[PDB]
A paper describes a structure:
During normal housekeeping, peptide fragments containing mutations can be bound by class I major histocompatibility complex (MHC) proteins and presented extracellularly where they are surveilled by CD8+ T cells of the cellular immune system. Thus, mutant peptides bound to an MHC protein must overcome self-tolerance to constitute immunogenic “neoantigens” which induce T cell responses. Two non-exclusive mechanisms by which a mutant peptide can overcome self-tolerance are by enhancing peptide binding to MHC proteins and altering the structural and physical features presented to T cell receptors (TCRs). Here, we explored methods to improve the accuracy of peptide-MHC structural modeling, focusing on nonamers presented by the human class I protein HLA-A*02:01.
As a test of our modeling and trained selection approaches, we deployed it against a novel tumor neoantigen whose structure has not yet been reported. The neoantigen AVGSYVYSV was identified in a melanoma patient and shown to induce a T cell response in a healthy donor. We crystallized and determined the structure of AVGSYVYSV bound to HLA-A*02:01 at a resolution of 1.9 Å. The peptide adopted a typical nonameric conformation through the binding groove, with valine at position 6 serving as a secondary anchor and facing down into the groove. We modeled 500 decoys using the ref2015/KIC protocol. The decoy with the lowest Rosetta energy deviated from the actual structure with Cα and HA RMSDs of 0.46 Å and 1.09. The decoy selected by our linSVR function, however, was better, with Cα and HA RMSDs of 0.38 Å and 1.02 Å, respectively (for comparison, the OLS and PLS functions selected a decoy with a HA RMSD of 1.56 Å, and the radSVR function selected a decoy with a HA RMSD of 1.88 Å, all poorer than those selected by either Rosetta energy or linSVR). A key error in the structure with the lowest Rosetta energy was an incorrect positioning of the peptide backbone from Ser4 to Val6, reflected by a 3.1 Å error in the placement of the Tyr5 carbonyl oxygen. The positions of backbone hydrogen bond donors and acceptors in the centers of peptides have previously been shown to substantially impact TCR binding and T cell sensitivity; thus the error in the low energy decoy could be significant. The side chain of Tyr5 of the peptide is incorrectly modeled in both cases, but in the low energy decoy, this error is exacerbated by the error in the backbone.
Numbering used by the authors:
A (entry chain B): 1 to 100
B (entry chain C): 1 to 9
C (entry chain A): 1 to 275
């Protein structure tokens, strides 16, 4: 069966400023089939209050999903997104890098 | 608005 | 400029785990405005944009009934396709359908489309003339024979040249502030050393709408397509989009590299330079 690997991006809606509320995004695109597990992490722990967009797909039939939560960045706090999918031998963790 | 009816394959 | 409406439908069989999942979503250009999810408790078509909430109970009752009709057909299809391809009940399979219409600057029908996929592959597609079918395999040819005998294409053609364009024009009016807008990209480049002798140049485009954009790197005017990392255009969550493209270059050659940004909100294409 066709299988396509998710491309994973973790980023903030607005430029990060310590102390200012923002939105943390994990965008997964280009994957197939549609079953996928996405978790936003704060210092390694699963963030429970996470919304996600309605399942949709691109012109090449691959799926995309946005997971997002409100957050206020700090200097010590590490954020990441952890994604599991049939194409991944183990869950992939992408760390949020604000200096990109 | 969606189509009123689709046909089976 | 030009505009379009598109509906996307996904059905996934889940053997022994309940009835197939069905998810429908509607867009005008890059702005979503309706959803249906078979696993939510509402069981109704629901608003996903403020400018669609003004539609009346007849709209939501009718959209709900027609989208459940889509759901039932896909349930039938999943069984039909198993028989076409001689597949067991145990496996999970995927059906996807997308259809809609484009209008031009005069806000009249440009072209329409109605496409179908099984397990992530083209299955059957209405050709651009809206009178004939492109069938990807032998099973899809079976569908084509059946849809030709039932004159399926004419009925879709009527929707795509009529209902589709007349409701797109309505949404474009009701959601004028969101849909008839263009937000030009806010652009910059970042520079970070990765070692003593290499640096990452990353060209950023932020807060733009609609999603269509082109980011390109040039070295002495030569496109660097093979050496560029270009991420997929991504939503910010506020109705705008972001994108970047990066190259790793030898330290000291920064002034050779320029980033070129094209977007319909820019009066003229932008070139960003390191000097």
């Amino acid at each position: 069966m066709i299988q396509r690997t998710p491309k994973i991006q973790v980023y903030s809606r607005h430029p990060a400023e310590n102390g200012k509320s923002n939105f943390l995004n994990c965008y997964v695109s280009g994957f197939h089939p549609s079953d996928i597990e996405v978790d936003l992490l704060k210092n390694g722990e699963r963030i429970e209050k996470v919304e996600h967009s309605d399942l949709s797909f691109s012109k090449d039939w691959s799926f995309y999903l946005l997971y997002y939560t409100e957050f206020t960045p700090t200097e010590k706090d590490e954020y990441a997104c952890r994604v599991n999918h049939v194409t991944l031998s183990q869950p992939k963790i992408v760390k949020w890098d604000r200096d990109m | 608005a969606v189509g009123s009816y689709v046909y089976s394959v | 400029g030009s505009h379009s409406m598109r509906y996307f439908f996904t059905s996934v069989s889940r053997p022994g785990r309940g009835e197939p999942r069905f998810i429908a979503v509607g867009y005008v250009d890059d702005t979503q405005f309706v959803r249906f999810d078979s696993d939510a408790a509402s069981q109704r078509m629901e608003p996903r944009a403020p400018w669609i909430e003004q539609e009346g109970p007849e709209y939501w009752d009718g959209e709900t009934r027609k989208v459940k009709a889509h759901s039932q057909t896909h349930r039938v299809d999943l069984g039909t396709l198993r028989g076409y391809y001689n597949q067991s009940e145990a496996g999970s399979h995927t059906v996807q359908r997308m259809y809609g219409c484009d209008v031009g600057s005069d806000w009249r029908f440009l072209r329409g489309y109605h496409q179908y996929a099984y397990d992530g592959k083209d299955y059957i597609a209405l050709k651009e003339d809206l009178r004939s079918w492109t069938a990807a395999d032998m099973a899809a040819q079976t569908t084509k024979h059946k849809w030709e005998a039932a004159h399926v294409a004419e009925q879709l053609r009527a929707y795509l040249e009529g209902t589709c364009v007349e409701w797109l024009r309505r949404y474009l009016e009701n959601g004028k502030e969101t849909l008839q807008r263009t937000d030009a990209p806010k652009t910059h480049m970042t520079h970070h050393a990765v070692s003593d002798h290499e640096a990452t140049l990353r060209c950023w485009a932020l807060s733009f709408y609609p999603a269509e954009i082109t980011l390109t790197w040039q070295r002495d005017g030569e496109d660097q397509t093979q050496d560029t990392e270009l991420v997929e255009t991504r939503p910010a969550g506020d109705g705008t989009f972001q994108k970047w493209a990066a190259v790793v270059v030898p330290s000291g050659q920064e002034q050779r590299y320029t980033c070129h940004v094209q977007h319909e909100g820019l009066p003229k294409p932008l070139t960003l330079r390191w000097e």
